[PDB]
């Protein structure tokens, strides 16, 4: 017994093949999942539930593996999925075939490292190529976004609900720009809360100018409906709290026990009049509520809600623009809930809901999802999740690309122009990537169900012409289609990270030459 006592090892071509095989496996289980003609997959969770989604990431997110590079690929998915949302509908699939041809030079006894070098060389050419054939666009023009929005969602089941979602997405993003960074304001996808409520229909689901609380009034008398509410966000609890420093009390005369009892009551009263002093209408706390305080707030005609998640609270704060407070005596009129167009508490059916909309200039809001069932709606928001995602990315970059394989062919021959201009051993790797690129539209045809070879060849033959760069494939016809009229248009950074991530996998995987298990630590 020598090395590690039941830790296996592997080396060389067997290893490299294993990764390639493991890689090749990873893509194909998803190769059907992309396109306007894509499939939609349903999954078995560990814990009993059901998830159905076309977004590959979640599918891969729910995948348990033993092969390491496979686990590597999994993480690769969520990173870009975190990064851009969609294209993971293609991201990994692009990687594996890149590898799939990549192995084709290994038996050529070609050291991968140099094959890596071309891969590096390839990327910059791709990056430069794409920028050349990128398309700047205005951001204020809403309808273009929606087409861009629709284009980005014309792969998911919300295709039939494109118009709403496109509006649904567009409005939500448009109202998110934290301008306190000068002219470098940032939107955030952590305030655009998504709320799934059962019943109703897609059409019933709509964007609400503010936030929703799945709670109910602590006391009946408080109005469930107010025109112009005034709001206080009380981070602190509204009731007596123990003296933190383990204080203790020894009374000697009779009255003190009752007296100290009144004193905490007074302390309660003490807090309230400070609140009523600012003429609020609304009491909000992430904590519980003294009913005795609640009594006086009821006396105050001031509505109170307790025990709310902080995340929503700040959004509530962001909704009416007011700022949260934990110090009632230090309450500031600058944090009044001014800018709440309406307070209401509705009934969805067995649940009270808090309506606070029509803010003057809401920066935060939550979307109310009304559909078929949460898992249906869970799919919906995932389509939303990306749907909002690319939009903000667009608000980062006004540059657009015709995806759908059109840019891809554009890249390919551009490299082919390079490859024949790039004599040397690395040339064959270089043209390999170009040829490797071609599979994504090929998938489309398989997803479409047409003559892939004939279509692609005509496609490639079409794009040998320098005059035309927007020739792509319609998803449903499976015919050569220039993109300008078809309108499937894509943000630059999306495909950027796509290629950007794609290569990083290979080189990372290409260096792999040995296996070691059993760390036991």
């Amino acid at each position: 017994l020598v090395l590690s006592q039941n830790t296996k090892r592997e080396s060389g071509r067997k290893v490299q093949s294993g990764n390639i095989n493991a890689a090749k496996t990873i893509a194909d289980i998803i190769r059907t999942c992309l396109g306007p003609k894509s499939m939609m997959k349903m999954l078995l969770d560990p814990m009993g539930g059901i998830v159905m989604t076309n977004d590959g990431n979640a599918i891969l997110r729910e995948i348990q593996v033993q092969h390491p590079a496979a686990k590597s690929m999994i993480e690769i998915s969520r990173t870009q999925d975190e990064e851009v949302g969609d294209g993971t509908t293609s991201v990994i699939i692009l990687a594996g075939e890149m590898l799939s041809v990549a192995e084709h030079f290994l038996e050529q006894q070609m050291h991968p490292t140099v094959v890596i070098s071309a891969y590096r060389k390839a990327l910059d050419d791709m990056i430069s190529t794409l920028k050349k054939i990128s398309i700047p666009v205005d951001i204020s023009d809403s309808d273009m976004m929606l087409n861009i929005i629709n284009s980005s969602i014309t792969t998911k089941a919300i295709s039939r609900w494109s118009s709403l979602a496109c509006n649904i997405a567009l409005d939500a993003v448009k109202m998110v720009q934290f301008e306190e960074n000068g002219r470098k304001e940032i939107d955030i996808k952590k305030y655009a809360r998504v709320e799934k409520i059962p019943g109703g229909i897609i059409e019933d689901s709509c964007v609400l100018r503010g936030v929703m609380i799945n709670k109910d009034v602590t006391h009946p008398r408080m109005r469930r409906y107010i025109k112009n509410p005034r709001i206080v966000l009380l981070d602190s609890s509204l009731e007596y709290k123990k003296g933190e420093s383990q204080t203790d009390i020894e009374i000697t005369r009779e009255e003190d026990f009752t007296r100290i009892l009144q004193m905490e009551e007074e302390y309660i009263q003490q807090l309230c009049e400070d609140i009523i002093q600012l003429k609020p209408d609304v009491v909000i706390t992430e904590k519980g509520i003294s009913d005795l305080a609640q009594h006086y707030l009821m006396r105050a005609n001031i509505t109170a809600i307790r025990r709310v998640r902080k995340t929503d609270n700040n959004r509530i704060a962001r909704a009416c623009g007011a700022r949260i407070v934990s110090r009632p005596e230090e309450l500031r009129e600058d944090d009044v809930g001014t800018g709440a167009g309406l307070l209401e508490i509705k009934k969805i059916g067995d649940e009270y809901f808090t309506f606070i909309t029509d803010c003057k200039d809401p920066k935060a809001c939550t979307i109310l999802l009304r559909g078929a069932s949460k898992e249906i709606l869970s799919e919906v928001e995932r389509n939303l999740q990306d749907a909002m995602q690319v939009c903000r990315n667009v608000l980062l970059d006004p540059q657009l690309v015709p995806g759908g394989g059109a840019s891809e062919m554009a890249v390919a021959h551009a490299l082919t122009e390079k490859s024949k201009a790039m004599t040397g051993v690395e040339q064959w790797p270089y043209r390999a990537v170009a040829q490797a690129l071609e599979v994504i539209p090929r998938t489309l045809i398989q997803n479409c169900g047409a003559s892939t070879i004939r279509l692609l060849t005509s496609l490639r033959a079409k794009h040998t012409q320098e005059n035309c760069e927007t020739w792509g494939v319609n998803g449903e016809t499976g015919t050569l289609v220039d993109m300008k009229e078809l309108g499937i248009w894509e943000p630059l950074a999306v495909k950027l990270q796509t290629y950007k991530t794609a290569v990083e996998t290979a080189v990372l995987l290409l260096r792999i030459d040995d296996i070691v298990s059993g760390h036991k630590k």
Binding site: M42, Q64, D248
Partner: protein, 525 residues
């Protein structure tokens, strides 16, 4: 394939998993098709704990029939919404679902791609809903119209006599509910049950009942005229939050501190004691107190000496009901105490059953909250009658909500069917098959009826498949002769949203179900 990735993993394939789900749902629907319909039969479920059902609302059944097939559980969830939305026709949804896929399979088994048929449904939902939209008969809030739909709903659930008995109760409950703008179905509604003497005698009470009684003998059981204290602040003893253990030197002082401790609560009752004696200077009227928390024994002594009814530990929603019935001003701080804060009822007493106690509140001037008192011979029946009670109430809530009402007995469906069949391939043609298939699925509801009702399916369909003339009427199927019948005249009805929601929901369900390929099972060990 992915077996390469994992050995313990499990995956299906396109034809395979597809075949699974249809069989799953078709298998699912077969079980439940025995249910819906007044001639239908409720089913009895047995817990592994030995508990028992007698229901027909499959939502309970599905929720309680343990299945492992995911799509079925998938079906369970959306239905769980639907019952949370309306309650019945949940039955229809699933039967709608499976037979939809059944016809869908007929075509995909013919090689026809699901996306095409899905799109065939896509329009198919559209045209019907418009037809659904236009055809709803706008009806105003006539009590009897409320009555019959309520009767329509209940006969699916309970005895024709029993339904009729309850049919009166709910609508009278319902009528006493609306503030002409906003019903909530929650507080105005109390569902209370006693294992007592009948199923039929189960009767709505003009007031509210409480699930408990006094905790002292001298409390008078009956109160002729009730003057009401609603409250929630504890009249039990309590000690401050802070470490406050005290000391003494004299047992005489020990008694004094005993006195001091009680005094704060002693003060509390006295205000009530005075205000009571202040308000009820008359001997005749009676005064009662309500606490959602507990009541101290010494406090019990206090009120007993003044004969003031108090109850402790009530459900937090009860006081709302106490308000909406007796107009009592629910309060916490008894210091700011007014006679104006009171509630008044025409009668309050306790009814003792077996070991438990119940407290009766009666004759509010303008009660807005009542109780659906359930008398019970059997526990399961109480539960069994209970959901149908829930089943009816929401329907009436749906009924009042919508100014229209749908003829029941599937009269809608043929109208859609002839309407949908009254669509040339204005569709892209290959889609019309799914449209042709889609309408075919719609006729299932009447089919299961006569299938439940014994009459032969096709011939009954054909005969009822009769728009008569230019007056191709809204025809329900006779529920005892299996004959064409006009539901409107016979007054068999249903809510527009009901029909509205179910198709929409079902449509969404189906397309996705047909739009899955393989079912993967690879999770952590």
């Amino acid at each position: 394939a992915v077996k390469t990735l994992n050995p313990k993993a499990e995956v299906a394939r396109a034809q395979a998993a597809l075949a699974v789900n249809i069989s799953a749902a078709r298998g699912l629907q077969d079980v439940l098709r025995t249910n819906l319909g007044p001639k239908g039969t409720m089913k009895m479920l047995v817990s592994g704990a030995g508990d028992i059902k007698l229901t027909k609302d499959g939502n309970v059944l599905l929720h309680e029939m343990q299945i492992q097939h995911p799509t079925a559980s998938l079906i369970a969830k959306v239905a769980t919404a639907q019952d949370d939305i309306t309650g019945d026709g949940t039955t229809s949804n699933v039967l709608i679902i499976g037979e939809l896929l059944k016809q869908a399979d007929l075509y995909i088994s013919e090689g026809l791609h699901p996306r095409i048929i899905t799109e065939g449904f896509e329009a198919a939902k559209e045209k019907a809903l418009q037809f659904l939209e236009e055809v709803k008969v706008s009806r105003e809030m006539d009590r009897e119209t409320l009555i019959d739909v309520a009767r329509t709903s209940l006969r699916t659930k309970v005895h024709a006599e029993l339904a009729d008995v309850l049919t009166e109760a709910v609508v009278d409950s319902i009528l006493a509910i609306k503030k002409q703008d906003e019903p909530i179905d929650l507080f105005m509604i109390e569902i209370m049950e006693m294992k007592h003497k009948s199923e039929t005698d189960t009767s709505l009470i003009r007031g509210l009942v409480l699930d408990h009684g006094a905790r002292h003998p001298d409390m008078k059981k009956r109160v002729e005229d009730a003057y009401i204290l609603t409250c929630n602040v504890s009249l039990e003893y309590e000690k401050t939050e802070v470490n406050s253990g005290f000391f003494y030197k004299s047992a005489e002082e020990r008694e004094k501190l005993v006195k001091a401790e009680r005094k704060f609560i002693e003060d509390r009752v006295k205000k009530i004691i005075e205000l009571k004696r202040k308000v009820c200077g008359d001997s005749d009227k009676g005064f009662v107190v309500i606490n959602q928390k507990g009541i101290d024994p010494f406090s019990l002594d206090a009120l007993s000496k003044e004969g003031i009814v108090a109850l402790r530990r009530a459900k937090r929603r009860n006081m709302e009901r106490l308000t909406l019935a007796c107009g009592g001003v629910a309060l916490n701080s008894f210091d700011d105490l007014s006679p104006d804060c009171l509630g008044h009822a025409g009668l309050v007493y306790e009814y003792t059953l077996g070991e438990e106690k119940f407290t009766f509140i009666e004759k509010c001037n303008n009660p807005r909250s009542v109780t659906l008192l359930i008398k019970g011979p059997n526990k399961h029946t109480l539960t069994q009658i209970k959901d149908a009670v829930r089943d009816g109430l929401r329907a009436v809530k749906n009924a009042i909500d919508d100014g229209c009402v749908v003829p029941g007995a599937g009269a809608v469906e043929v109208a859609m069917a002839e309407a949908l069949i009254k669509h040339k391939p204005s569709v892209k043609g290959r889609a019309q098959l799914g449209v042709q298939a889609f309408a075919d699925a719609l006729l299932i509801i009447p089919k299961v009826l006569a299938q439940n009702s014994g009459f032969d399916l096709q011939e009954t369909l054909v005969k009822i498949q009769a728009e008569h003339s230019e007056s191709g009427q809204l025809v329900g199927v006779d529920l005892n002769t299996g004959e064409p019948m006009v539901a409107a005249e016979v007054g068999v009805w249903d809510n527009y949203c009901v029909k509205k929601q179910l198709l929409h929901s079902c449509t969404v369900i189906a397309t996705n179900i047909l739009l899955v390929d393989e079912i993967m099972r690879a999770g952590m060990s």
